[PDB]
Write an enzyme that holds these catalytic residues in place. Structure first.
Site, PDB file in Angstrom:
ATOM      1  N   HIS A 199       0.810  -1.197   0.000  1.00  0.00           N
ATOM      2  CA  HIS A 199       0.000   0.000   0.000  1.00  0.00           C
ATOM      3  C   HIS A 199       0.856   1.264   0.000  1.00  0.00           C
ATOM      4  CE1 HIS A 199       0.446   0.112   4.555  1.00  0.00           C
ATOM      5  NE2 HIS A 199       0.406   1.384   4.278  1.00  0.00           N
ATOM      6  N   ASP A 238      -0.443  -7.607   2.115  1.00  0.00           N
ATOM      7  CA  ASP A 238       0.121  -6.280   1.914  1.00  0.00           C
ATOM      8  C   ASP A 238       1.659  -6.362   1.912  1.00  0.00           C
ATOM      9  OD1 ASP A 238       0.248  -3.460   1.859  1.00  0.00           O
ATOM     10  OD2 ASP A 238      -0.248  -3.275   3.932  1.00  0.00           O
ATOM     11  N   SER A 277       4.135   2.834   8.237  1.00  0.00           N
ATOM     12  CA  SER A 277       3.862   1.772   7.252  1.00  0.00           C
ATOM     13  C   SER A 277       5.053   1.213   6.515  1.00  0.00           C
ATOM     14  CB  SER A 277       2.967   2.233   6.131  1.00  0.00           C
ATOM     15  OG  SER A 277       1.615   2.172   6.539  1.00  0.00           O
TER      16      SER A 277
END
Lengths: 29, 9, 258
Positions: free
Chosen positions: C43, C99, C205
């Site tokens: 992502h 992910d 992230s």
């Protein structure tokens, strides 16, 4: 990478511990 | 949901 | 990272900064797994709801860093990407399942005191260590608290932050959210009754959740910072990509394209 992965030049390779890694090892009951 | 810089060359 | 502390110099030599060329800004964290392969969350590169779709020429990876904003002359190395690979079944539509993405660097990076790769888990290290109650460690240059916004307080750290967090049992993870969680994810954090706090947050992230094996003393990357609802909210937990469940795709990509 490879054979030597996960051994830090300034800590494991010198046998020095960082300030909080014993907290991790102490939880592996 | 999903998660002042000095210029570099 | 919320409620963490400053990292020591050389404490996470595998930590990578994904950096946007224009505007020059932090994109995500990432980790060095060999001299020319970086692992991050998919992502960070492709998220159509927010119109993100970066290609190789949009980004640089910065390795060996400690300060968030300083160009660390003579310590950090900057590399350009040759190719990005996103898991073919990454589910950006529903729950960020699978992910994970791999990035091949244009040229190998030389290792040093500040730049060194993390190990990827084998079945048996995953089995012994990924247990509720065991703590792992998360690092990143993301926000120090959820809000702040464009107001007062600042909230972006000066140097790499670190926090140690316990893996939570899957029932508890599942009962804290309305998102459908899969076997490719695990969650971590303190429960409200435990009296200790901490979490990853925006800008963290793609970064590594790592654990130190008691059997051979090496650090293994077990998770990738993936998603959460807020940052350090009581009764909520951070969710991470389960790196060992996706290892066969990692091996395949490196064997075919490296």
């Amino acid at each position: 990478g490879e054979a030597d992965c996960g051994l830090r030049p300034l800590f494991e390779k010198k046998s020095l511990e960082d300030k909080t890694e014993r907290e991790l090892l102490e939880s592996y009951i | 949901x999903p998660x002042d810089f000095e210029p570099i060359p | 990272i919320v409620e963490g502390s400053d990292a020591e110099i050389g404490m996470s030599p595998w930590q990578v900064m994904l950096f946007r060329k224009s505007p020059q800004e932090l994109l995500c964290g990432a980790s060095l797994i060999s001299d020319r392969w970086v692992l991050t969350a998919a992502h960070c590169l492709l998220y159509p709801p927010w119109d993100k779709n970066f290609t190789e020429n949009d980004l640089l990876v910065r390795i060996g860093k400690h300060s968030r904003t300083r160009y660390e002359r003579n310590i950090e190395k900057i590399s350009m990407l040759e190719k990005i690979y996103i898991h073919p079944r990454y589910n950006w539509r529903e729950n960020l399942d699978r992910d994970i993405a791999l990035m091949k660097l244009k040229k190998p990076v030389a290792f040093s005191d500040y730049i060194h790769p993390v190990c990827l888990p084998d079945r048996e290290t995953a089995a012994s260590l990924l247990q509720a109650g065991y703590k792992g460690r998360v690092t990143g240059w993301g926000n120090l608290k959820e809000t702040w916004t464009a107001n007062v307080g600042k909230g972006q750290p000066s140097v790499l932050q670190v926090v140690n967090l316990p893996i939570v049992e899957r029932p508890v993870c599942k009962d804290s959210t309305r998102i459908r969680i899969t076997d490719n994810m695990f969650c971590a954090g303190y429960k409200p009754d435990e009296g200790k706090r901490g979490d990853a947050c925006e800008g963290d992230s793609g970064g590594p959740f790592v654990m130190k094996s008691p059997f051979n003393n090496r650090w293994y990357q077990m998770g990738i910072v993936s998603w959460g609802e807020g940052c350090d909210r009581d009764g909520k937990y951070g969710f991470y990509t389960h790196v060992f469940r996706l290892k066969k795709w990692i091996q395949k990509v490196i064997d075919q394209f490296g």
